[PDB]
Ligand binder design. Structure first.
Ligand SMILES: CCCCCCCCO[C@@H]1O[C@H](CO)[C@@H](O)[C@H](O)[C@H]1O
Ligand SMILES: CCCCCCCCO[C@@H]1O[C@H](CO)[C@@H](O)[C@H](O)[C@H]1O
Ligand SMILES: CCCCCCCCO[C@@H]1O[C@H](CO)[C@@H](O)[C@H](O)[C@H]1O
Ligand SMILES: CCCCCCCCO[C@@H]1O[C@H](CO)[C@@H](O)[C@H](O)[C@H]1O
Ligand SMILES: CCCCCCCCO[C@@H]1O[C@H](CO)[C@@H](O)[C@H](O)[C@H]1O
Ligand SMILES: CCCCCCCCO[C@@H]1O[C@H](CO)[C@@H](O)[C@H](O)[C@H]1O
Ligand SMILES: CCCCCCCCO[C@@H]1O[C@H](CO)[C@@H](O)[C@H](O)[C@H]1O
Ligand SMILES: CCCCCCCCO[C@@H]1O[C@H](CO)[C@@H](O)[C@H](O)[C@H]1O
Ligand SMILES: CCCCCCCCO[C@@H]1O[C@H](CO)[C@@H](O)[C@H](O)[C@H]1O
Ligand SMILES: CCCCCCCCO[C@@H]1O[C@H](CO)[C@@H](O)[C@H](O)[C@H]1O
Ligand SMILES: CCCCCCCCO[C@@H]1O[C@H](CO)[C@@H](O)[C@H](O)[C@H]1O
Ligand SMILES: CCCCCCCCO[C@@H]1O[C@H](CO)[C@@H](O)[C@H](O)[C@H]1O
Ligand SMILES: CCCCCCCCO[C@@H]1O[C@H](CO)[C@@H](O)[C@H](O)[C@H]1O
Ligand SMILES: CCCCCCCCO[C@@H]1O[C@H](CO)[C@@H](O)[C@H](O)[C@H]1O
Ligand SMILES: CCCCCCCCO[C@@H]1O[C@H](CO)[C@@H](O)[C@H](O)[C@H]1O
Lengths: 308, 308, 308
């Protein structure tokens, strides 16, 4: 027995998001559906396992959960649980809309309860410190709301989806200023540096959720978001040697949410005949990088250095 | 004699804004007009009294005014004066558009002169400190511009209204990042905590002003704003026991601007047949809470603990 | 011989931008074309000279360039080089679209390489300090992307232009919060104060680029941007005596980018019959102020206090 590190939920998260990206190509290229289904089954199976492991953690390692929850930094990774639950719901919708809808509402109520309890509590002061200003804060604050937005739109609740979308989008622009100033001043320690990959996520997760709610219309807002997303991509590419200066590690799955959302949004840009060449590049690049993450993970697994 | 605490202008402000919310229901439910007129007369009467008291303060307690004006924290409450003046103008428009227009321009020129003189002066450095980063800064920086926007639109100056709207909206997104980071790090002292209610205001005041200028069209922007507004509501509800930990007090009128603007925007969402159930909840909730503020205020009055 | 101070590129930048503003009036008032052509030739000639001087600096004063490049404050002025290159390209387009397109791509690739190398590197921490939070950061982070956006739109690449536009716009809203908080707390030393003029630029450069890409449609976004732009103008006017408290100097060309972009955007508001009176005021004001900058510069030149 061992307590599951909560950040491992980033693995089914990235795979699930990538399943959904391929799903959106089925009308252009039918074989995409099989790729999507395989990714989606693997993501769902991994999610089931990790949920069961986390249930074990809650039952037998509760003080570990309590400590992560109260931490002004580590609490954020708990948001991966409802986020992945919703994405698995979105996958399962293709086979069973009833079960999908249950997972989606569980994830939505869960994430909103979580942020309402913990994100707001930080405003009491004295616990969160300047050094707590980490990219992981995007998970409960931003990513969870975007995921609710897109999932609720899937279920047909577009106007409710826009409320969650707005919560996420404005929360993003309200947090990022202080994050980037912090990064400029304070060197993020190597042990946290893989989480720089989460910096890729906001614009791409945002535009993917937006396009899910607005019927795939590639409009001025969507183009604006893509532009900032690619700026951040270029910055993170330049920074990649620094990010991995102490070595390649499993934390690099942090990048997968943004990469998968880049792939998803690319399918919509392509459908809309906007920047098709860029879209092809983005889709291929993101799949190659996630493919590398999978290969590195299988490698770590086949040597027993996966989870503590 | 006593010098009027400037923050008391929040009382006619909240009542006036609530009058305007009910005014906007008259076409759906005719009895709303009487509720609106009663609220509007009470707000106007209280505003007259407080204006006269503040004129007395300027004449006989000028050094108190000077000190509040030069304070990098207390100056903000002075913006309540032109804000309330404009809202009373908006009320009076139903009876006398000429007098309304005079009040609206006085409030608009006044607030813009005030911010231009004092908000900009802060950029000289050395007076404002990190600890000065308070929710009250929204009043001169954000709320005053939104109120000009909506008031000018009432008078038919829609394009000028959009300029004030943009000034307010961008000023809001430019300030809030540093406010929330400050709240996270530094525990706001109990004596200032009721001003947390001002954190509710921006998104709702914003969308109410937007809907006033754009002919009540409930569009993507409006939905986005409502979503972030409700996020903040949920956060502030969770925080409410901490906000009042040292007891219930008259400062809780800080919440009334956001609550009244929630009510106002709800009437437009309802008219537009967008999220009608949420709109009903929002309208009823905000009225109940302001009703509680009024009851608590009458209580304080009937015991002589109103103004110093 | 002497090493050219890099900030002098602000002179052809302001003149070039002003040429483009007058160009956009030719369809309303034909004589505007001659004014535009004169400004454009002067800007281009000054740019050629300064480029040659900077090439000399790279060849014979390379360690000076290295030091400015690695500085977390001084690096930003290097972005003036590709920005001016693109604006000169935009001017030359009226005479030779081939040469214009070459300059535009050189400036675009150059600025994007520059930011990708240097703006991202700051996120490694430990070099940039709180005191490095200066208005000049807008140049590589914001202004360069807006200039690419408008230049690429000129060439017919509207969707690519929107990507650069979005990168600039979101980068602006992400930086400004921390800049204004810094200005509030820390008094910017007189030697840097003329750079306060760069604070005028973002909203106006933004709306000018937006109107260049969206076919001159003066819409809600454009009006919103103008409103915040004028707020900042009013603030900077009030601050002007403090800005120049140690005397008038050549650094005041910092204001010219925002002033010229105010003039440019005014032509589009006027064409669109939106706020025509404000547009006339803005156009005349900005030209008078740049005219004053030119007169003060000729004065300094005719006395040998231009460049070190
Ligand atoms: C899409 C986001 C995936 C995030 C995966 C990266 C984190 C996986 O591991 C996480 O790393 C941390 C830093 O050492 C710890 O603080 C966390 O509790 C942890 O589980
Ligand atoms: C995934 C869900 C994580 C839930 C962990 C909930 C932790 C709440 O734990 C809290 O710690 C408090 C001390 O501050 C005490 O009230 C109690 O120990 C408990 O309420
Ligand atoms: C992701 C699934 C939803 C998360 C449920 C977390 C429940 C948290 O538990 C709550 O924690 C509070 C502190 O913030 C404690 O003080 C409360 O007493 C407790 O009810
Ligand atoms: C960071 C926020 C950027 C917001 C951009 C909103 C741009 C809206 O601009 C509008 O976009 C709509 C769809 O493209 C249409 O009205 C028009 O094409 C355009 O007027
Ligand atoms: C990111 C979205 C990826 C979409 C993959 C598209 C790859 C197809 O490639 C394209 O096929 C077209 C017709 O089908 C050909 O006309 C084009 O020349 C070719 O580039
Ligand atoms: C809508 C905003 C209404 C604000 C009302 C709350 C403030 C009323 O009182 C205010 O409280 C302060 C804090 O103790 C003082 O600093 C102020 O000058 C004061 O008048
Ligand atoms: C509601 C209006 C409030 C107006 C108060 C104006 C206060 C200006 O007071 C200023 O204090 C300065 C010291 O800094 C001195 O110039 C003078 O005392 C005065 O100009
Ligand atoms: C709400 C009504 C409008 C407010 C008018 C306030 C007038 C402020 O008064 C001004 O204060 C300046 C400092 O910022 C002083 O230095 C000036 O000398 C003085 O004219
Ligand atoms: C924080 C800023 C959010 C800006 C959101 C702008 C969204 C505009 O998006 C557009 O909205 C318009 C009205 O809904 C219409 O063009 C379309 O429905 C949509 O394209
Ligand atoms: C926030 C705005 C509040 C609007 C109050 C509406 C309350 C009316 O209630 C509604 O009446 C409808 C017809 O009039 C009925 O058909 C609906 O079932 C009922 O909910
Ligand atoms: C539109 C922007 C024009 C900027 C021109 C102003 C700067 C010109 O000079 C600049 O001033 C600085 C401050 O002393 C130095 O740090 C720079 O390297 C310098 O060249
Ligand atoms: C306008 C273009 C400015 C280019 C200046 C490039 C400066 C790169 O200079 C770098 O300094 C490093 C020390 O940190 C060493 O690698 C080398 O000296 C060099 O690579
Ligand atoms: C404006 C014209 C484009 C600018 C080109 C600048 C080239 C910078 O030069 C680069 O600087 C890096 C540091 O950030 C060095 O470490 C690299 O080795 C070097 O290639
Ligand atoms: C800081 C960001 C402000 C974004 C404002 C977006 C406002 C879009 O609002 C929309 O604007 C479009 C053009 O005016 C049209 O759809 C409509 O007129 C309006 O619905
Ligand atoms: C900022 C853009 C400046 C545009 C300059 C316009 C100046 C023209 O001035 C205008 O001429 C009109 C007809 O041509 C007359 O009908 C108007 O009364 C007059 O104001």
């Amino acid at each position: 027995p061992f307590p599951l590190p909560t950040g491992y939920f980033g693995i089914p998260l990235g795979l699930a998001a990538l399943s959904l990206a391929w799903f959106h190509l089925e009308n252009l290229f039918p074989a995409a559906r099989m790729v999507s289904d395989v990714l989606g089954i693997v993501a769902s199976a991994v999610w089931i396992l990790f949920i069961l492991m986390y249930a074990y953690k809650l039952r037998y390692y509760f003080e570990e959960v309590r400590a992560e929850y109260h931490s002004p930094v580590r609490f954020s990774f708990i948001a991966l649980i409802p986020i992945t639950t919703m994405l698995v719901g979105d996958i399962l919708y293709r086979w069973n809309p009833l079960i999908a809808e249950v997972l989606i509402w569980i994830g939505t109520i869960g994430q909103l309860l979580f942020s309402t309890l913990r994100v707001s509590e930080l405003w009491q002061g004295g616990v969160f410190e300047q050094k707590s200003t980490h990219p992981s804060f995007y998970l409960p604050a931003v990513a969870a709301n975007f995921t609710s937005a897109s999932s609720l739109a899937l279920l047909g609740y577009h106007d409710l989806g826009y409320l969650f979308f707005g919560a996420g989008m404005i929360a993003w622009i309200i947090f990022e200023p202080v994050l980037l100033q912090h990064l400029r001043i304070s060197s993020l320690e190597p042990q946290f540096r893989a989480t720089m990959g989460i910096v890729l996520a906001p614009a791409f997760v945002c535009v993917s959720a937006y396009l899910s709610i607005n019927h795939g219309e590639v409009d001025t807002l969507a183009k604006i978001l893509w532009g900032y997303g690619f700026l951040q991509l270029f910055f993170l590419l330049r920074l990649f040697p620094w990010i991995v200066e102490k070595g390649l590690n499993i934390g690099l799955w942090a990048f997968s949410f943004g990469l998968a959302s880049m792939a998803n949004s690319a399918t919509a840009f392509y459908h809309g005949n906007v920047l098709q060449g860029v879209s092809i590049f983005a889709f291929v690049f993101s799949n190659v990088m996630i493919g590398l993450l999978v290969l590195m993970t299988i490698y770590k697994l086949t040597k027993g250095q996966f989870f503590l």
